[model samples]
Each structure stands twice: as structure tokens, then as C-alpha cells.
Target: KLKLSDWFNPFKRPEVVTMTKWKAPVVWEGTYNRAVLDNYYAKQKITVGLTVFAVGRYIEHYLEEFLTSANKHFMVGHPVIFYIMVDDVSRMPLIELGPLRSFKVFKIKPEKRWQDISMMRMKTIGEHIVAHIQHEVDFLFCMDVDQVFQDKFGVETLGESVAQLQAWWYKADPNDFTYERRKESAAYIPFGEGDFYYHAAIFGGTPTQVLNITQECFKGILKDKKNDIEAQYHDESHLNKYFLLNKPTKILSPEYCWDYHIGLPADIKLVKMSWQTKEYNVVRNNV
Candidate 1:
């Protein structure tokens, strides 16, 4: 028995929108008219670019499950391309993609440390955009390999630049957010100044905007490396720094991407995507 007026009252005061507890204006599923968005994007023929890395045995452990779930729940009818970056091309999965959806696997050298692998993806994405994806896709999504789709991730998630609120931090005090704190590190954010801790796992934007952010992160990582300083969370820290300095055009709620281990609350009506559990030490050390 949800009344339309109770959901969104046009006459509501401005303070109502600005005073919400979320660090950023969350894009909740209930707030959007999905059918309208889906129809609009369908007519526009907007192409989507999705990038993910599955190095080492992650190619064997996660790729098939991710692709299978994605085929079912990802932007169904839209033209989408998945740019799969992997250390071992031989292990790449061969899932059947539907019309307007395809995959490309690119071989990359495996890194010794997991941190290096994560940080280096920004650089690789920048290169791939220039060499392969720029002309092919209208918008791009950078996602972590350790996740699977559980609910529809449709056109409603598209924007000029979209960042998802970190599920674990969305309800915590902003002052307690685990953002990079060292001034010497490139990802540093002075306490009490951030709007949200955006998870690097799921982010996207138009090709130009996506490229700009990725390049900025790559540069930040390089600068920190030159000074012999590494940010606390590697690429994730730099991603937060970039979004803080240049806020994203849209912010998605944790419902768009949540950790499976963290039990869903009543507020999370639907989980579009979720992290998959794995043996971290074994997986990382194997690479």
C-alpha cells in the first residue's frame, strides 16, 4: 500500500532532499522510473562498455559465474561489450552472449602483488580506451571481477559519471570513513571534508569522463610511487580522491552493489550486484 504522494511529493521542502543521512544523494530503485529510462535509452541506442580483470585462477574461479549471471541480469537489450583483461587467455570462459552483447579478452602480464594488480588496472583501462574502446562505446563501466549480478542493472544506472556508495560505509559517520588520511599520499582527504567513500568496484561514465577519471587515478598512483608512498587502499583510495575533488554526476545506493556476506537489510529492496566469497590468500598467492 505505497501511495504515490508518500513516495515523492513535488511540494516537499528543499531541506527534505538535502538533509538525508546518505553522504551523497542516493539513487534508490524506488526513486527512478525504470520503464521510462529503459524506453528512452533503447530508442537512443546507447552502447555500453564494461571492463573487468580476472587474473590468475580468478579466470577459472569467477569468470563463468560472473558472465552467466550478467547475461541474465545486466542491461538486457542494449548493445554492451565486456572488455575482459586477464593474465591467462587460455583460461578465459566461453559464455554465449546474446545479440548486442559481446566479449573481448585481452592478455595482460600478471602482477606479483595483489595491490599492484588493482592499482595498475587504472593505467590499463586508460590505454585500452585509447586503443580499443573509445570509438566503440558511448559509456563505460569499470567493475571488479569478484562480483555477480542478482537483480536487474539496467539503463537507470547510466549517467555522465556514476559512482556507487560503499555498502559498509554508507551508514557510518562521515568522519569515521576510511579514506586515505596521509597528506603525503596522493589519495589523502582531510578529515571532515568528504561527501562519501565511493567504492571503486562499480563506477562508470561517458567514455571521455571515464577516461579522464582513470587517467587522473593513474597519475596519482604514479606520483605516489615516485615519492615512495602508497595509499592505504591502493587504487580504491585514489578513486575516492578523484571523486571527492570532482564529484560524480550521480551517486548509486548500496543496493546497486553490496557484499554478500553483509546480510541485506529491509531497506535494500533489491540487490543488483554482490561480491562473491573466495579464499583471498590462496587466490592472491597463486597469482
Candidate 2:
């Protein structure tokens, strides 16, 4: 265990499960002191990295808002490197990033299906980690661009392995988690036995840890495809399966990725990010 830093104090949320049975923290708002976190990371001189893919309709529809909000809120004051992957580099949004924030944009070929597009992000993230991301930052967060930042998503979220609980289904029964049911596919999760339903929209860790996660997910993805078995929720199904086998060291509360349509819940003290509304079938079919 590391030294007890004075900066962080775990807050108690009434009836809110705050820690995994394995003892990792479930971060909720009002539970952290930003100045304290900033002071510590500043001395440590850590750089946080982020990756977001904006392809096809997502680029035109969500990229600008996503990046603008991110620049205003994400990892403020710490050095941050944004790794953006898009189908068209020419369409990248121009946002004035704050000091210590910079970005790289890579072009990706549009996939034939939305499922393929989402599933392939694991491969792309894994490839980039091997290529350069491992050397560029101390921590990494990979997120989908269909969401926008709402408040400071700072050092509190950092961990060896971090997972975001799906905003809509965090409290749902495990059997209702929409997991891959068939044993024929690699992503299967037994009906009675999984942890929280994690959202693929946000997952992160140290570069090496994220590298392992993406590589593991992508491996199963390939095998599942070859077997002619696509999981119920595509990459998300694989992601849930991965978390079942390898638990996250830190979990984010639903407040971290709240959907406005879900309406407010009692324990949601603050919203760190929100899902942007999109026409599901239309957006998915566009590319």
C-alpha cells in the first residue's frame, strides 16, 4: 500500500455501494478535494492521456461539443495528450485547448457496420498503445465521443485500472445486464455471476494496463467473429466479460456518465459527463 495522502477522504453515500467487494473505491461527487489532488499530481509531474474516436456522423454531430467541453473540464492543469481517431482527419474540430493540453489526430477507415466500428476501437487503442501512447503519458482514458464533459474529470479518476458503471444499468440485476448469453462466444457471462455492467464509453488505466485490456478484448473479438458469433452488445459485451475476469481497481459512479434522459437520481450529487442525444439507427447507418 502507498502512503496515506491527506488530500483524499472517501465520502459516505447513503446506501450507495462505495467499494467493490475486492476493495476498490467507487468514486462519487463531493468525495474529493480538487486542490489537494492537483497539488499532489503537480509535484509528481504526471501526464494524463485521452483517446476518443469520432467517425462518420459522430464527427459532425458530436466532436465539436465533446472537444470544447473536454478542453474546459478534463484533466485541468495537468499535461494531457489527446489521441483522436477519426475517419476524416480533415474534419477534426478546432478547439482552443488550455495550457498543457495537446492532441494528435489519426485517420481511420470507416467500418462496414456500427458494431464493427465500435468493436474495432479496442484494436485501434491497443495498436496505438504499442506504437506510442505507452511512452507519452502516465495514465490513459479512452472514451467514446458521443458524450460531452460537464465538470472537472480530474486526478480523482486515476487508478491502476478504472471502470465506469453504465449510467442506465448500474443498479440493474446482473441477469438483465445484456451480457453475451451463448457459451459459443468468448464474451459470455454466466447469468448469475458478474459484477456491475461497465460502460465501454469510459475505461482507463495506466498505459500498460489499458494495453492489456484492449489487447485482451480485441483477441476475443477476433475469435468470436471467426466463430460467426457476435455478442449481444458487441464490444460492450466483451468489455463486461473482461471486467468479470479482471476487476477494475477503481469504479466511477453513475454520476460520471449520467444520461439526461435517465432523469436525476437521489445520490447523484454532480454530473461529470453527459451522453449527447443521437439518432441511433440513423447515425449508425450513416457510415
For model 1, the stretches where C-alpha displacement exceeds 4 angstroms are: 1-25
Question: What TM-score would you give candidate 2 relative to the actual structure?
Answer: 0.95
How do the residues 1-287 of candidate 1 rate in per-residue lDDT, one tens digit apiece? 32223333223323222123433345665666667766777788788989999987788888888888887887877989999999988898888987778888999998888888988999999999999899998889999888899988987777778888888887777688899999999999998888888899999988888898999999999999999999998898999999988888777778888886789886576889988886687578734
| lDDT against the true structure, each candidate | 0.82, 0.88
Per-residue lDDT value at 84 in model 1 = 91
Estimate the TM-score of every prediction. Answer: 0.90, 0.95
Put down candidate 2 lDDT per residue, 91-203, tens digits, no spaces. 89878888888998999988888889998999999999989999999999999999999998999888889999999888888888888899999999888989899999999
**Per-residue error (Å), model 2, residue 261:** 0.4
Error of 1 at 199 (Å): 0.6
